[PDB]
């Protein structure tokens, strides 16, 4: 269930075929584990900037 801790997804969670399917916003690519979202550039959307 996506209702269970967002299905362990980093960002978007969908309950397709009774199973979890995670996706990401633009600027990120889904990780090999199909859960984490990996940034593509130095300034991915939604991240505060440390430098």
């Amino acid at each position: 269930l996506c209702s269970l801790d967002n299905g362990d997804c980093d960002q978007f969670c969908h309950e397709e075929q009774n199973s979890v399917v995670c996706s990401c916003a633009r600027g990120y690519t889904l990780a090999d584990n199909g859960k984490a979202c990996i940034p593509t550039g130095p300034y991915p959307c939604g991240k505060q900037t440390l430098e």
Binding site: D10, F12, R26, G41, Y43, G46
Partner: protein
């Protein structure tokens, strides 16, 4: 912003400030990408011509991180009307792309269903801007941010003297003296999720600022995601 805190270095990078001829900020906006800014439609009546400044946190001086951008295209929602403040949303396309850097970065656009079931069901969101720090005061020179609790939709309707349409939601406190205010309009209301911030609202209106028994009213972004995509696509 009434109460809350000052946005520290790199804390509110998606904040945008609309400035008039005198380089005075009159409304806020949210950076969606290098060419697009999200703001409120009622901000388009607050000034003849205007520009968009990013990376600013103090309008009293020039640090060297700020950057001004001219507005190429203005896309205001056709159904907007000052009579109800419904459909209070607009998207601006800049002539030149924003250079992302310290204090300058976009906020993420979430998906509709996920946003409504996971982001708007969170305890709080965050609103920011250079608006007034008090109801009768002047515009703030420092960018401020404020954690605003999501407000039960029912409680809000009962507290409002005006109609709360399905294109708006409320946030803030019933009596605590913290709230967005005039000048913050068009500004961002973002929701944090696992260290990633998603745009969830647009500073729209309110009966006064931080008044007891009253909340802050924001344009419900999830209700315009498709409209926003179209505006950015075409």
């Amino acid at each position: 912003i009434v109460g809350g805190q000052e946005c520290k270095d790199g804390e509110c990078p998606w904040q945008a400030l609309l400035i008039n001829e005198e380089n005075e900020g009159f409304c806020g906006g949210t950076i969606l990408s290098e060419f697009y800014i999200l703001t409120a439609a009622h901000c388009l009546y607050q000034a003849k011509r205007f520009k968009v400044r990013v990376g600013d946190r103090n309008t009293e001086q020039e640090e060297g991180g700020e950057a001004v951008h001219e507005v190429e295209v203005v896309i205001k929602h056709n159904r907007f009307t000052k009579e109800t403040y419904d459909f209070d949303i607009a998207v601006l396309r800049l002539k030149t792309p924003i250079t992302f850097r310290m204090n300058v970065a976009p906020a993420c656009l979430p998906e509709r269903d996920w946003a409504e079931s996971t982001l708007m069901t969170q305890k709080t969101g965050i609103v920011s801007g250079f608006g007034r720090t008090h109801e009768k005061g002047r515009q703030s020179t420092r960018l401020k941010m404020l954690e605003v609790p999501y407000v039960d939709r029912n409680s809000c309707k009962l507290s409002s003297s005006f109609i709360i349409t399905q294109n708006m939601f409320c946030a803030g406190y019933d009596t605590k003296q913290e709230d967005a205010c005039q000048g913050d309009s068009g500004g961002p209301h973002v929701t944090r999720f696992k260290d990633t911030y998603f745009v969830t609202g647009i500073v729209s209106w309110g009966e006064g600022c931080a008044r007891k028994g009253k909340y802050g009213i924001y344009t419900k972004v999830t209700a315009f995601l498709k409209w926003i995509d179209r505006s950015m696509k075409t």
